[PDB]
Amino acid sequence: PSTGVELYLDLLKRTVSNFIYQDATHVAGLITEAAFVEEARESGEDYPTVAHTMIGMKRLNNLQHCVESALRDGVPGDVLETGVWRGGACIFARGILKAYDVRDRTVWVADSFQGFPKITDDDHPMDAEMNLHQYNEAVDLPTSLATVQRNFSRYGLLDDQVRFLPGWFKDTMPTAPFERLAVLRMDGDSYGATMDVLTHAYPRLSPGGFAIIDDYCIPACREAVHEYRDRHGISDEIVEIDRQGVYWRRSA
Amino acid sequence: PSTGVELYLDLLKRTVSNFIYQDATHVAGLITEAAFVEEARESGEDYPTVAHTMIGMKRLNNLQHCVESALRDGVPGDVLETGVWRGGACIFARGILKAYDVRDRTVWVADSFQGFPKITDDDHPMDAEMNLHQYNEAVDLPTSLATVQRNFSRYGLLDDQVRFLPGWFKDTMPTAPFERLAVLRMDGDSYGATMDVLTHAYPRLSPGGFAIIDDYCIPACREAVHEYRDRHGISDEIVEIDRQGVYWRRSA
Numbered sequence: 001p002s003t004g005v006e007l008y009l010d011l012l013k014r015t016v017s018n019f020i021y022q023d024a025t026h027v028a029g030l031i032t033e034a035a036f037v038e039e040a041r042e043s044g045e046d047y048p049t050v051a052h053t054m055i056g057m058k059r060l061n062n063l064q065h066c067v068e069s070a071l072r073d074g075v076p077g078d079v080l081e082t083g084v085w086r087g088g089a090c091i092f093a094r095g096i097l098k099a100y101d102v103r104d105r106t107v108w109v110a111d112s113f114q115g116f117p118k119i120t121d122d123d124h125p126m127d128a129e130m131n132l133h134q135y136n137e138a139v140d141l142p143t144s145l146a147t148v149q150r151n152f153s154r155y156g157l158l159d160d161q162v163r164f165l166p167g168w169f170k171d172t173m174p175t176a177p178f179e180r181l182a183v184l185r186m187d188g189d190s191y192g193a194t195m196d197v198l199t200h201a202y203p204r205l206s207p208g209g210f211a212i213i214d215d216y217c218i219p220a221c222r223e224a225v226h227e228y229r230d231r232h233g234i235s236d237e238i239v240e241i242d243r244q245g246v247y248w249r250r251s252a
Numbered sequence: 253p254s255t256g257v258e259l260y261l262d263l264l265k266r267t268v269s270n271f272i273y274q275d276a277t278h279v280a281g282l283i284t285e286a287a288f289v290e291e292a293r294e295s296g297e298d299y300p301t302v303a304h305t306m307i308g309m310k311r312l313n314n315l316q317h318c319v320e321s322a323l324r325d326g327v328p329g330d331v332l333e334t335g336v337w338r339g340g341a342c343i344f345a346r347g348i349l350k351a352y353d354v355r356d357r358t359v360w361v362a363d364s365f366q367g368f369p370k371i372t373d374d375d376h377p378m379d380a381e382m383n384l385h386q387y388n389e390a391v392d393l394p395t396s397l398a399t400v401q402r403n404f405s406r407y408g409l410l411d412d413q414v415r416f417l418p419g420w421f422k423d424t425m426p427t428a429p430f431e432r433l434a435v436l437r438m439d440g441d442s443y444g445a446t447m448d449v450l451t452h453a454y455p456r457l458s459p460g461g462f463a464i465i466d467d468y469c470i471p472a473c474r475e476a477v478h479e480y481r482d483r484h485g486i487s488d489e490i491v492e493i494d495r496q497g498v499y500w501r502r503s504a
């Protein structure tokens with residue numbers, strides 16, 4: 001980092017992930033100690049008590065790569081994240097556009113703003129077995145729209161190039177009012193959330209655009225990804241980011 | 253549209269003062285409630301549990317004004333802060349130099365790295381009356397050199413343009429190896445710490461340089477300032493920053 005832009009985006013990553021203050025993690029799942037562990041935050045493997053994103057430094061770097069590549073290569077369209085929690089990844093995305101004075105692209109912030117949904121009879125058996133809803137409280141997942149908006153405002157990044165899509169993805173995605181995406185960041189964990197968004201948002205991903213699957217390490221998510229790719233004849237290389245996330249670049 | 257440098261420095265101020273995550277204050281002195289209060293942090297009036305500086309946004313803005321003016325006007329010399337706590341003001345100063353790619357000035361970080369000193373028989377009576385040592389634990393003041401170095405490194409700002417001066421100001425200042433200062437930021441609270449640094453560091457402040465007195469609202473500090481200015485015939489206007497700090501600009 002040397003230029004003002006490089007310094008800003010570097011600091012923004014360290015700030016939204018709270019490498020700066022090194023907040024404790026929630027203790028849930030396979031995590032058994034609250035201590036901040038550098039390696040865990042680096043790879044987005046903990047559940048921050050305070051930080052605005054849980055995706056970690058490697059997945060923030062990937063998001064920067066994808067947005068910057070889209071700008072560099074003239075890939076048209078907006079940035080959408082499905083599953084935003086406290087908003088840190090979307091805050092970073094808006095910051096990237098701000099750094100490069102991009103005025104013609106929007107960051108779409110899609111979430112229930114309620115955490116994971118209760119399991120229903122419609123759910124895939126793998127989703128029903130996992131029952132992600134049981135973890136909502138343990139990792140402070142339910143985060144209101146007002147809270148997320150407040151978080152954007154603390155960075156000076158709440159403006160008309162940030163638009164919110166509140167509700168369940170099955171309700172918000174089919175008629176979401178974007179025409180094209182350059183980056184589609186999927187971070188909803190379940191077979192259902194992944195299939196919802198691949199079905200309803202992926203067709204608007206421009207060729208040359210990036211599809212990021214945050215939760216590929218989760219069997220149910222991975223199942224949706226393969227079902228969807230097999231259905232559509234998608235063979236674009238799945239590239240690992242860290243121990244959780246992957247992405248591909250959409251070929252024409 | 254804000255430049256990369258503007259975006260970086262704005263974010264750095266919000267981060268070192270922790271406007272981003274809004275940490276509670278310690279309950280000490282006249283502060284009886286732990287809540288983060290926006291107005292208190294804006295004017296540096298609380299005792300942050302986590303933030304790297306307690307000086308607040310108004311005094312951070314002052315520091316930026318002083319450093320940028322020195323750079324712009326070609327006032328020679330380094331930046332020294334006497335009394336750094338967790339290092340956030342000095343981290344900000346180093347960030348300013350980084351933002352403008354200044355490679356030939358150093359940020360000097362001077363502190364006991366142990367909190368306020370124990371009172372002795374040699375202390376000024378106003379300092380003995382205050383006995384600031386009694387507040388060390390209450391506001392988590394003692395902060396080791398290793399911790400402060402770690403804090404710099406979290407921002408990517410620990411490099412050879414940051415130099416540390418560990419020990420009591422009366423011992424470290426007379427032979428501190430800087431030749432010239434552009435900004436002398438005094439933040440030691442007491443008659444003693446203020447007089448130590450005015451006596452031993454102020455003569456190295458360049459004409460056109462800035463002398464910042466963080467704790468001018470404290471009677472003992474103010475007494476040292478006036479005693480020193482009267483002795484040396486200094487009549488440069490004392491300009492108020494907020495409810496605590498003032499500064500003057502040294503005329504030749």
Ligand SMILES: CC[C@H]1OC(=O)/C=C/[C@H](C)[C@@H](O[C@@H]2O[C@H](C)C[C@H](N(C)C)[C@H]2O)[C@@H](C)C[C@@H](C)C(=O)/C=C/C=C/[C@@H]1CO[C@@H]1O[C@H](C)[C@@H](O)[C@@H](O)[C@H]1OC
Pocket residue numbers: 028029030047054129130132135138139187189214215217218219244
């Ligand atoms: C705490 C939330 C998290 O909870 C778990 O980490 C649960 C783990 C279970 C305890 C595990 O079970 C245990 O395994 C042991 C090896 C053997 C045990 N023995 C006694 C039977 C068995 O009890 C796992 C394997 C259960 C299976 C079904 C699984 O993979 C579930 C994933 C749940 C993830 C959820 C959701 O976290 C998401 O993760 C993705 C990857 C992150 O980016 C992020 O979005 C994050 O959101 C907050």
Ligand SMILES: CC[C@H]1OC(=O)/C=C/[C@H](C)[C@@H](O[C@@H]2O[C@H](C)C[C@H](N(C)C)[C@H]2O)[C@@H](C)C[C@@H](C)C(=O)/C=C/C=C/[C@@H]1CO[C@@H]1O[C@H](C)[C@@H](O)[C@@H](O)[C@H]1OC
Pocket residue numbers: 280281282381382384387390391441466467469470471496
């Ligand atoms: C908690 C630390 C702080 O502690 C106080 O704020 C103490 C205040 C006392 C309680 C006060 O007493 C009360 O006054 C009332 C009018 C009447 C009360 N009635 C019960 C008799 C009496 O109990 C004061 C006036 C006592 C006198 C001796 C004084 O001026 C002490 C100052 C100490 C400041 C210290 C040092 O703060 C420094 O500040 C500067 C401005 C900041 O940038 C920062 O660096 C900060 O350091 C971290």
Ligand SMILES: Nc1ncnc2c1ncn2[C@@H]1O[C@H](CSCC[C@H](N)C(=O)O)[C@@H](O)[C@H]1O
Pocket residue numbers: 052053054055081082083084085086087088089090110111112113114115116117141142143167168169170187188189192193
């Ligand atoms: N079916 C669904 N519809 C809408 N939101 C959902 C959903 N299933 C899960 N979510 C949301 O998906 C998010 C998963 S956590 C997202 C982490 C975030 N990307 C970060 O940067 O840290 C939660 O905020 C949860 O409320």
Ligand SMILES: Nc1ncnc2c1ncn2[C@@H]1O[C@H](CSCC[C@H](N)C(=O)O)[C@@H](O)[C@H]1O
Pocket residue numbers: 304305306307333334335336337338339340341342362363364365366367368369393394419420421422439440441444445
């Ligand atoms: N005589 C002395 N010599 C050296 N350090 C001293 C001192 N008296 C007080 N200190 C130090 O002065 C500091 C006061 S607090 C400094 C606040 C800091 N400028 C910030 O940005 O938040 C403490 O870190 C304390 O250890």
Ligand SMILES: [Mg+2]
Pocket residue numbers: 187188189214215
């Ligand atoms: Mg995830």
Ligand SMILES: [Mg+2]
Pocket residue numbers: 439440441466467
């Ligand atoms: Mg002070």
